[PDB]
CSV table of C-alpha atoms in Angstrom, one decimal:
chain,number,residue,atom,x,y,z
I,198,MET,CA,-28.2,-10.1,2.1
I,199,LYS,CA,-27.2,-8.0,5.1
I,200,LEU,CA,-24.2,-6.1,3.6
I,201,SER,CA,-21.5,-3.9,5.1
I,202,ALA,CA,-22.4,-1.3,2.5
I,203,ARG,CA,-24.0,1.8,4.0
I,204,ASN,CA,-24.7,3.1,0.5
I,205,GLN,CA,-27.8,1.0,-0.3
I,206,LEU,CA,-29.9,3.5,-2.3
I,207,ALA,CA,-33.4,2.6,-3.5
I,208,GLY,CA,-35.0,3.5,-6.8
I,209,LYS,CA,-36.7,2.2,-10.0
I,210,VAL,CA,-34.8,1.0,-13.1
I,211,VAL,CA,-35.3,3.4,-16.0
I,212,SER,CA,-33.0,1.8,-18.6
I,213,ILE,CA,-30.9,-1.3,-19.2
I,214,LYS,CA,-28.2,-1.2,-21.9
I,215,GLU,CA,-27.8,-4.7,-23.2
I,216,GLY,CA,-24.4,-6.1,-24.3
I,217,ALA,CA,-22.6,-9.3,-25.0
I,218,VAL,CA,-21.1,-9.8,-21.4
I,219,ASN,CA,-21.6,-6.6,-19.5
I,220,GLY,CA,-24.5,-4.2,-19.6
I,221,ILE,CA,-25.6,-1.0,-17.9
I,222,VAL,CA,-28.6,-0.5,-15.6
I,223,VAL,CA,-30.1,3.0,-14.8
I,224,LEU,CA,-31.9,3.6,-11.5
I,225,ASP,CA,-33.9,6.6,-10.5
I,226,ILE,CA,-32.6,7.0,-6.9
I,227,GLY,CA,-35.0,9.8,-6.1
I,228,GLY,CA,-34.5,13.6,-6.0
I,229,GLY,CA,-33.6,13.9,-9.7
I,230,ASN,CA,-30.4,11.9,-9.2
I,231,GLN,CA,-29.6,8.9,-11.3
I,232,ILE,CA,-27.0,6.1,-10.9
I,233,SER,CA,-25.5,3.9,-13.5
I,234,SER,CA,-24.1,0.4,-12.9
I,235,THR,CA,-21.8,-1.6,-15.1
I,236,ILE,CA,-22.5,-5.3,-14.2
I,237,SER,CA,-22.3,-8.7,-15.7
I,238,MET,CA,-25.3,-9.7,-17.8
I,239,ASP,CA,-25.5,-13.0,-16.0
I,240,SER,CA,-26.5,-11.0,-13.0
I,241,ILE,CA,-28.8,-8.6,-14.8
I,242,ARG,CA,-30.8,-11.6,-16.0
I,243,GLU,CA,-30.4,-13.7,-12.8
I,244,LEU,CA,-31.9,-10.9,-10.7
I,245,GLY,CA,-34.8,-10.4,-13.1
I,246,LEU,CA,-34.0,-6.7,-13.9
I,247,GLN,CA,-36.4,-5.2,-16.4
I,248,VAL,CA,-37.3,-1.5,-16.9
I,249,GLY,CA,-39.4,-0.1,-14.0
I,250,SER,CA,-38.0,-2.7,-11.5
I,251,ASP,CA,-37.1,-2.0,-7.9
I,252,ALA,CA,-33.4,-2.5,-6.9
I,253,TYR,CA,-30.8,-0.7,-4.9
I,254,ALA,CA,-27.4,0.7,-5.9
I,255,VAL,CA,-25.1,-0.9,-3.4
I,256,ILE,CA,-21.7,0.9,-3.3
I,257,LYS,CA,-18.8,0.3,-1.0
I,258,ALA,CA,-17.6,3.6,0.6
I,259,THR,CA,-13.9,3.2,-0.4
I,260,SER,CA,-15.0,3.3,-4.1
I,261,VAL,CA,-16.7,6.7,-3.7
I,262,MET,CA,-14.6,9.9,-4.2
I,263,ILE,CA,-15.4,13.5,-3.4
I,264,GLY,CA,-15.4,16.5,-5.6
I,265,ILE,CA,-16.3,20.2,-5.2
I,266,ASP,CA,-16.8,23.4,-7.2
I,267,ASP,CA,-13.9,25.8,-7.2
A,99,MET,CA,-13.4,19.0,-14.9
A,100,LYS,CA,-15.8,16.7,-16.7
A,101,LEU,CA,-15.1,12.9,-16.1
A,102,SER,CA,-16.2,9.5,-17.0
A,103,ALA,CA,-18.3,9.3,-13.8
A,104,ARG,CA,-21.9,9.8,-14.8
A,105,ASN,CA,-22.5,9.2,-11.1
A,106,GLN,CA,-21.9,12.6,-9.7
A,107,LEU,CA,-24.0,12.7,-6.6
A,108,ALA,CA,-24.3,16.2,-5.3
A,109,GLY,CA,-24.9,16.8,-1.6
A,110,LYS,CA,-24.1,18.7,1.5
A,111,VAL,CA,-21.4,17.3,3.9
A,112,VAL,CA,-23.0,16.2,7.2
A,113,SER,CA,-20.1,14.5,9.0
A,114,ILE,CA,-16.4,13.8,8.9
A,115,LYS,CA,-14.9,11.0,10.9
A,116,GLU,CA,-11.2,11.7,11.1
A,117,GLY,CA,-8.4,9.1,11.1
A,118,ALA,CA,-4.7,8.9,10.8
A,119,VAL,CA,-4.6,8.2,7.0
A,120,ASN,CA,-8.1,8.1,5.6
A,121,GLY,CA,-11.4,9.5,6.9
A,122,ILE,CA,-15.1,9.1,6.3
A,123,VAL,CA,-17.2,12.0,4.7
A,124,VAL,CA,-21.0,12.1,4.5
A,125,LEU,CA,-23.1,13.9,2.0
A,126,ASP,CA,-26.8,14.3,2.5
A,127,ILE,CA,-27.5,13.6,-1.2
A,128,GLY,CA,-31.2,14.5,-1.2
A,129,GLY,CA,-34.4,12.5,-1.1
A,130,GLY,CA,-33.6,11.2,2.3
A,131,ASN,CA,-30.5,9.5,0.9
A,132,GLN,CA,-27.1,9.6,2.5
A,133,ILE,CA,-23.7,8.5,1.1
A,134,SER,CA,-20.5,7.5,2.9
A,135,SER,CA,-17.1,8.1,1.2
A,136,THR,CA,-13.9,6.8,2.8
A,137,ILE,CA,-11.0,9.0,1.4
A,138,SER,CA,-7.6,10.3,2.4
A,139,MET,CA,-7.4,13.0,5.1
A,140,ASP,CA,-5.1,15.0,2.9
A,141,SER,CA,-7.8,15.2,0.3
A,142,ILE,CA,-10.4,16.2,2.8
A,143,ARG,CA,-8.3,19.2,3.8
A,144,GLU,CA,-7.2,20.4,0.3
A,145,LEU,CA,-10.8,20.5,-0.9
A,146,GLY,CA,-11.8,22.4,2.3
A,147,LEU,CA,-14.4,19.8,3.4
A,148,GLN,CA,-16.3,20.9,6.6
A,149,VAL,CA,-19.8,20.1,7.8
A,150,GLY,CA,-22.4,21.9,5.6
A,151,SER,CA,-20.0,22.3,2.7
A,152,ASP,CA,-21.1,21.6,-0.9
A,153,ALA,CA,-19.4,18.6,-2.6
A,154,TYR,CA,-20.2,15.8,-5.0
A,155,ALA,CA,-20.0,12.0,-4.5
A,156,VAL,CA,-18.1,10.7,-7.5
A,157,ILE,CA,-18.7,7.0,-8.0
A,158,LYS,CA,-17.3,5.0,-11.0
A,159,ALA,CA,-20.1,3.2,-12.8
A,160,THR,CA,-18.1,-0.1,-12.6
A,161,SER,CA,-18.1,0.2,-8.8
A,162,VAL,CA,-21.9,0.1,-8.5
A,163,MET,CA,-23.6,-3.2,-7.7
A,164,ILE,CA,-27.3,-3.9,-7.9
A,165,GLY,CA,-29.3,-5.7,-5.2
A,166,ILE,CA,-33.0,-6.6,-4.9
A,167,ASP,CA,-35.3,-7.6,-2.0
A,168,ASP,CA,-35.7,-11.2,-0.9
V,147,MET,CA,-14.0,19.8,-10.3
V,148,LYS,CA,-11.6,19.4,-8.5
V,149,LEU,CA,-11.4,15.8,-7.5
V,150,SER,CA,-10.0,14.3,-4.4
V,151,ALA,CA,-7.6,12.1,-6.3
V,152,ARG,CA,-3.9,13.0,-6.1
V,153,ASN,CA,-3.4,10.6,-9.0
V,154,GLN,CA,-4.4,12.9,-11.8
V,155,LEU,CA,-1.8,11.9,-14.4
V,156,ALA,CA,-1.9,13.8,-17.7
V,157,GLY,CA,-0.8,12.3,-21.0
V,158,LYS,CA,-1.9,12.1,-24.7
V,159,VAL,CA,-4.5,9.7,-26.0
V,160,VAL,CA,-2.9,7.2,-28.4
V,161,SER,CA,-5.6,4.6,-28.9
V,162,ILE,CA,-9.3,3.9,-28.4
V,163,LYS,CA,-10.5,0.3,-28.6
V,164,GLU,CA,-14.2,0.6,-29.4
V,165,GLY,CA,-16.6,-1.9,-28.0
V,166,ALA,CA,-20.3,-2.6,-27.7
V,167,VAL,CA,-20.7,-1.2,-24.2
V,168,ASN,CA,-17.2,-0.3,-22.9
V,169,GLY,CA,-14.0,0.9,-24.5
V,170,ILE,CA,-10.3,1.2,-23.6
V,171,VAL,CA,-8.4,4.5,-23.8
V,172,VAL,CA,-4.6,4.7,-23.6
V,173,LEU,CA,-2.7,7.8,-22.6
V,174,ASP,CA,1.0,8.4,-22.9
V,175,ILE,CA,2.1,10.0,-19.7
V,176,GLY,CA,5.8,10.2,-20.3
V,177,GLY,CA,8.9,8.4,-19.1
V,178,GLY,CA,7.9,5.3,-21.1
V,179,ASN,CA,4.6,5.0,-19.2
V,180,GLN,CA,1.1,4.4,-20.5
V,181,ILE,CA,-2.2,3.9,-18.6
V,182,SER,CA,-5.3,2.1,-19.9
V,183,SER,CA,-8.8,2.9,-18.7
V,184,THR,CA,-11.8,0.8,-19.5
V,185,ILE,CA,-14.8,3.1,-19.5
V,186,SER,CA,-18.3,3.0,-21.0
V,187,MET,CA,-18.3,4.0,-24.7
V,188,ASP,CA,-21.1,6.6,-24.1
V,189,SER,CA,-18.6,8.3,-21.8
V,190,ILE,CA,-15.8,8.0,-24.3
V,191,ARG,CA,-18.0,10.1,-26.6
V,192,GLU,CA,-19.2,12.4,-23.8
V,193,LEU,CA,-15.6,13.3,-22.9
V,194,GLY,CA,-14.8,13.8,-26.6
V,195,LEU,CA,-11.8,11.6,-26.7
V,196,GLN,CA,-10.1,11.4,-30.1
V,197,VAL,CA,-6.6,10.1,-30.8
V,198,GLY,CA,-4.1,12.7,-29.9
V,199,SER,CA,-6.3,14.4,-27.3
V,200,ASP,CA,-4.8,15.8,-24.2
V,201,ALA,CA,-6.2,14.3,-21.0
V,202,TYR,CA,-5.7,13.1,-17.4
V,203,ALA,CA,-6.1,9.6,-16.1
V,204,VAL,CA,-7.9,9.7,-12.7
V,205,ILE,CA,-7.1,6.9,-10.3
V,206,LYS,CA,-8.2,6.6,-6.6
V,207,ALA,CA,-5.3,6.1,-4.2
V,208,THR,CA,-7.1,3.2,-2.6
V,209,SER,CA,-7.3,1.6,-6.1
V,210,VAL,CA,-3.5,1.6,-6.6
V,211,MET,CA,-1.6,-1.5,-5.4
V,212,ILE,CA,2.1,-1.9,-5.1
V,213,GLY,CA,4.2,-4.8,-6.3
V,214,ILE,CA,7.9,-5.6,-6.5
V,215,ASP,CA,10.2,-7.8,-8.5
B,99,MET,CA,3.6,-12.8,-10.5
B,100,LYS,CA,2.1,-12.2,-14.0
B,101,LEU,CA,-1.1,-10.4,-13.6
B,102,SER,CA,-4.2,-9.1,-15.4
B,103,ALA,CA,-3.3,-5.4,-14.7
B,104,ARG,CA,-2.2,-3.5,-17.8
B,105,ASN,CA,-0.8,-0.6,-15.6
B,106,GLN,CA,2.3,-1.9,-13.9
B,107,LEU,CA,4.2,1.3,-13.7
B,108,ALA,CA,7.8,1.2,-12.3
B,109,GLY,CA,9.1,3.8,-10.0
B,110,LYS,CA,11.0,4.7,-6.8
B,111,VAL,CA,9.1,5.2,-3.5
B,112,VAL,CA,9.6,8.8,-2.2
B,113,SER,CA,7.4,8.8,0.9
B,114,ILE,CA,5.4,6.5,3.2
B,115,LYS,CA,2.7,7.6,5.5
B,116,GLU,CA,2.2,5.1,8.3
B,117,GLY,CA,-1.2,4.7,9.9
B,118,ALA,CA,-3.0,2.5,12.4
B,119,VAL,CA,-4.6,0.3,9.7
B,120,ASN,CA,-3.6,1.4,6.3
B,121,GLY,CA,-0.8,3.5,5.0
B,122,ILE,CA,0.0,5.6,1.9
B,123,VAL,CA,3.1,5.0,-0.3
B,124,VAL,CA,4.2,7.4,-3.1
B,125,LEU,CA,6.2,6.4,-6.2
B,126,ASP,CA,8.2,8.5,-8.6
B,127,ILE,CA,7.3,6.9,-11.9
B,128,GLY,CA,9.4,9.3,-14.0
B,129,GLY,CA,8.6,12.3,-16.1
B,130,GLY,CA,7.4,14.4,-13.2
B,131,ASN,CA,4.7,11.9,-12.7
B,132,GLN,CA,4.0,10.3,-9.3
B,133,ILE,CA,1.4,7.9,-8.1
B,134,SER,CA,0.4,7.3,-4.4
B,135,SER,CA,-1.0,4.0,-3.3
B,136,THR,CA,-3.2,3.6,-0.2
B,137,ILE,CA,-2.6,0.0,1.0
B,138,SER,CA,-2.6,-2.0,4.2
B,139,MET,CA,0.3,-1.4,6.5
B,140,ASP,CA,0.7,-5.2,6.9
B,141,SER,CA,1.5,-5.5,3.2
B,142,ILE,CA,4.0,-2.6,3.2
B,143,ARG,CA,6.3,-4.5,5.6
B,144,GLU,CA,6.0,-7.9,4.0
B,145,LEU,CA,7.3,-6.5,0.7
B,146,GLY,CA,10.0,-4.6,2.6
B,147,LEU,CA,9.1,-1.2,1.2
B,148,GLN,CA,11.4,1.6,2.6
B,149,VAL,CA,12.3,4.9,1.0
B,150,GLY,CA,13.9,4.9,-2.4
B,151,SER,CA,13.1,1.2,-3.1
B,152,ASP,CA,12.1,-0.1,-6.6
B,153,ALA,CA,8.4,-1.1,-7.0
B,154,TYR,CA,5.5,-0.8,-9.5
B,155,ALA,CA,2.1,0.9,-9.3
B,156,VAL,CA,-0.5,-1.7,-10.3
B,157,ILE,CA,-3.8,-0.3,-11.4
B,158,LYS,CA,-6.6,-2.4,-12.9
B,159,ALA,CA,-8.0,-0.8,-16.1
B,160,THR,CA,-11.6,-0.8,-14.8
B,161,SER,CA,-10.3,1.3,-11.9
B,162,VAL,CA,-9.0,4.2,-14.0
B,163,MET,CA,-11.1,7.1,-15.1
B,164,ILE,CA,-10.4,9.8,-17.7
B,165,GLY,CA,-10.5,13.5,-17.4
B,166,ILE,CA,-10.3,16.7,-19.6
B,167,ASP,CA,-10.6,20.5,-19.4
Y,16,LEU,CA,2.1,-7.7,-5.1
Y,17,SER,CA,0.4,-6.0,-2.1
Y,18,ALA,CA,-2.8,-8.0,-2.2
Y,19,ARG,CA,-3.0,-10.5,0.6
Y,20,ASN,CA,-5.8,-12.3,-1.3
Y,21,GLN,CA,-4.0,-14.4,-3.9
Y,22,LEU,CA,-6.3,-17.4,-4.2
Y,23,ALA,CA,-5.2,-20.2,-6.4
Y,24,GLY,CA,-7.8,-22.2,-8.4
Y,25,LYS,CA,-8.3,-23.7,-11.9
Y,26,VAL,CA,-10.0,-21.9,-14.7
Y,27,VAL,CA,-13.3,-23.5,-15.3
Y,28,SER,CA,-14.9,-21.2,-17.9
Y,29,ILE,CA,-14.1,-18.1,-19.9
Y,30,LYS,CA,-16.9,-15.9,-21.3
Y,31,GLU,CA,-15.4,-13.9,-24.1
Y,32,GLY,CA,-16.5,-10.4,-25.2
Y,33,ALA,CA,-15.6,-7.6,-27.6
Y,34,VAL,CA,-13.6,-5.7,-25.0
Y,35,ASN,CA,-14.1,-7.5,-21.6
Y,36,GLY,CA,-14.2,-11.1,-20.6
Y,37,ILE,CA,-15.1,-13.1,-17.5
Y,38,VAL,CA,-12.9,-15.9,-16.2
Y,39,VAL,CA,-14.3,-18.2,-13.5
Y,40,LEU,CA,-11.9,-19.9,-11.1
Y,41,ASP,CA,-12.8,-22.8,-8.8
Y,42,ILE,CA,-10.4,-22.0,-6.0
Y,43,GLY,CA,-11.2,-25.1,-3.9
Y,44,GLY,CA,-13.6,-26.0,-1.1
Y,45,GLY,CA,-16.8,-25.4,-3.0
Y,46,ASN,CA,-15.7,-21.9,-3.7
Y,47,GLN,CA,-15.7,-20.2,-7.1
Y,48,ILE,CA,-14.5,-16.7,-8.1
Y,49,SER,CA,-15.2,-14.7,-11.3
Y,50,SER,CA,-13.0,-12.0,-12.7
Y,51,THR,CA,-14.2,-9.4,-15.3
Y,52,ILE,CA,-11.0,-8.5,-17.2
Y,53,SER,CA,-10.0,-7.3,-20.7
Y,54,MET,CA,-9.6,-9.6,-23.6
Y,55,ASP,CA,-6.1,-8.1,-24.1
Y,56,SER,CA,-5.4,-9.4,-20.6
Y,57,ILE,CA,-7.1,-12.8,-21.0
Y,58,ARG,CA,-5.2,-13.5,-24.2
Y,59,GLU,CA,-1.8,-12.3,-23.1
Y,60,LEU,CA,-1.9,-14.6,-20.0
Y,61,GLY,CA,-2.8,-17.5,-22.2
Y,62,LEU,CA,-5.7,-18.5,-20.0
Y,63,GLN,CA,-7.3,-21.6,-21.3
Y,64,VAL,CA,-9.9,-23.6,-19.6
Y,65,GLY,CA,-8.4,-25.6,-16.7
Y,66,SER,CA,-5.1,-23.7,-16.5
Y,67,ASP,CA,-3.6,-22.9,-13.1
Y,68,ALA,CA,-3.9,-19.2,-12.1
Y,69,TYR,CA,-4.8,-17.0,-9.1
Y,70,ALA,CA,-7.6,-14.7,-8.3
Y,71,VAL,CA,-5.9,-11.6,-6.8
Y,72,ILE,CA,-8.4,-9.2,-5.0
Y,73,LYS,CA,-7.7,-5.9,-3.1
Y,74,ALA,CA,-8.7,-6.0,0.6
Y,75,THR,CA,-10.3,-2.6,0.5
Y,76,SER,CA,-12.5,-3.7,-2.4
Y,77,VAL,CA,-13.9,-6.8,-0.5
Y,78,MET,CA,-17.1,-6.3,1.5
Y,79,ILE,CA,-18.6,-8.5,4.3
Y,80,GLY,CA,-22.1,-9.7,4.5
Y,81,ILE,CA,-24.0,-12.1,6.8
Y,82,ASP,CA,-27.4,-13.6,6.8
Y,83,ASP,CA,-29.8,-12.9,9.7
Q,268,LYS,CA,-30.0,-10.8,-3.7
Q,269,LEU,CA,-26.9,-8.8,-4.4
Q,270,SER,CA,-25.4,-8.8,-7.9
Q,271,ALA,CA,-21.9,-10.0,-6.7
Q,272,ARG,CA,-20.7,-13.1,-8.5
Q,273,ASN,CA,-18.2,-13.6,-5.6
Q,274,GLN,CA,-20.1,-14.3,-2.4
Q,275,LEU,CA,-17.6,-16.4,-0.6
Q,276,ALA,CA,-18.9,-18.1,2.6
Q,277,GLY,CA,-16.6,-18.5,5.6
Q,278,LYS,CA,-16.0,-17.9,9.3
Q,279,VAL,CA,-14.3,-14.8,10.8
Q,280,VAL,CA,-10.8,-15.5,11.9
Q,281,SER,CA,-9.6,-12.1,13.1
Q,282,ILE,CA,-10.8,-8.5,13.4
Q,283,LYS,CA,-8.1,-5.8,13.4
Q,284,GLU,CA,-9.5,-2.6,15.0
Q,285,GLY,CA,-8.9,0.9,14.0
Q,286,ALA,CA,-10.3,4.4,14.5
Q,287,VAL,CA,-12.1,4.6,11.1
Q,288,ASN,CA,-11.3,1.4,9.2
Q,289,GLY,CA,-10.7,-2.2,10.3
Q,290,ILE,CA,-9.6,-5.4,8.6
Q,291,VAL,CA,-11.4,-8.8,8.8
Q,292,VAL,CA,-10.0,-12.1,7.6
Q,293,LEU,CA,-12.4,-15.0,6.7
Q,294,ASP,CA,-11.5,-18.7,6.2
Q,295,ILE,CA,-13.8,-19.5,3.3
Q,296,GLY,CA,-12.9,-23.2,3.7
Q,297,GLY,CA,-10.3,-25.3,1.9
Q,298,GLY,CA,-7.3,-23.3,3.2
Q,299,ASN,CA,-8.4,-20.1,1.6
Q,300,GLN,CA,-8.6,-16.8,3.4
Q,301,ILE,CA,-10.1,-13.4,2.3
Q,302,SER,CA,-9.2,-10.0,3.8
Q,303,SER,CA,-11.8,-7.1,3.8
Q,304,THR,CA,-10.9,-3.6,5.0
Q,305,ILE,CA,-14.1,-2.0,6.1
Q,306,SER,CA,-15.4,0.8,8.4
Q,307,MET,CA,-15.4,0.0,12.1
Q,308,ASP,CA,-19.0,1.3,12.3
Q,309,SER,CA,-19.9,-1.2,9.6
Q,310,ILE,CA,-18.5,-4.0,11.7
Q,311,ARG,CA,-20.8,-2.6,14.3
Q,312,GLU,CA,-24.0,-3.1,12.4
Q,313,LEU,CA,-23.0,-6.6,11.3
Q,314,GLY,CA,-21.8,-7.5,14.7
Q,315,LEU,CA,-18.8,-9.4,13.5
Q,316,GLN,CA,-17.0,-11.4,16.2
Q,317,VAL,CA,-14.3,-14.0,15.7
Q,318,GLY,CA,-15.7,-17.4,14.6
Q,319,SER,CA,-18.9,-15.7,13.2
Q,320,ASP,CA,-20.6,-16.9,10.0
Q,321,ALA,CA,-20.3,-14.4,7.1
Q,322,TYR,CA,-19.7,-14.1,3.4
Q,323,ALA,CA,-16.9,-12.2,1.7
Q,324,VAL,CA,-18.5,-10.2,-1.1
Q,325,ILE,CA,-16.4,-9.2,-4.1
Q,326,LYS,CA,-17.7,-7.6,-7.4
Q,327,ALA,CA,-16.5,-9.3,-10.6
Q,328,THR,CA,-14.8,-6.2,-12.0
Q,329,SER,CA,-12.4,-5.9,-9.0
Q,330,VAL,CA,-10.9,-9.4,-9.5
Q,331,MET,CA,-7.7,-9.7,-11.3
Q,332,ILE,CA,-6.1,-12.9,-12.5
Q,333,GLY,CA,-2.4,-13.8,-12.1
Q,334,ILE,CA,-0.3,-16.7,-13.1
Q,335,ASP,CA,3.1,-18.1,-12.5
């Protein structure tokens, strides 16, 4: 785990939406911003993610778009 | 215009690395957090992205991974 | 917002496959073309998508591939 | 060449922007709809993509978003 | 297709879900790849366990990591 | 511990340089190769040279499956 992703943003898990195969984690990344992650449940279990846990959203730059207010 | 991205990370553009086809924008997203977004140069112009401009990081929830410490 | 995507293809919503966590929306963009988008169900509700709703599919250019016969 | 992508949209290429590493191709998919695909320049040659050629936009469903308003 | 990464392997497991599924390919050499895809897509391709298929992954979506 | 189901181990075979992005190709063993387009500055932090030990990292939702 040294990854090419510059976007490795730290926060605490606030919610986990549990499903059959995929679920949704909710991290408080700090500053009143929150990130949501659709990931496989195999991994949500494997990594030991429960509510209040410490993890990072790890996002590759080419998957981030940009928007403005016009 | 209201989209499926719950991940709308609002921040101020800090840098733009310009390339032939795509470039790399940087928002200072707050909380000491910084995001990198590789996108087309054409898009960077049409939105009017310069340093210190207000924009949002738009990240699809299925593009977010989770990592933890070791 | 606007969004940096050149690929903002407008069409009419024809179907919603409802799931436990995600769903599948399908828009008719015209010319015999349809696009499907798997998104979280909570967002399907947040965007207010009903059958027959008018919308745009939003695809990042670096997310589109090209293939040939 | 059968593939998991639901979106395999046929069209004619109208422009190609060449770059050092990647390029951007643009397809006329019909109906006043056009999709652009940022891909590697290496792959653009291997398929033989020049202007007006027949190809498909291939978009994985989990890569498509939806918009309104 | 424009993806240089078209890695052939044999389907080892398929986890089925309401809308999505996960296929797992053993592409050879102690390597295994998993693909989260729609059930519409898993059924249409006729993917049974052990059938011969390819994992096809876009270059700009692959990251690189090392260990210290 | 990153959530990627695809963490493919291999040695760097080539690094194609660009102004903003570059493209690495790994031999993950068994005649398989992966290509990863990433920022040149990110190749900086990771220090990738040819013949280096690294992993190709792919999230499950970006993998498609194809067949004959």
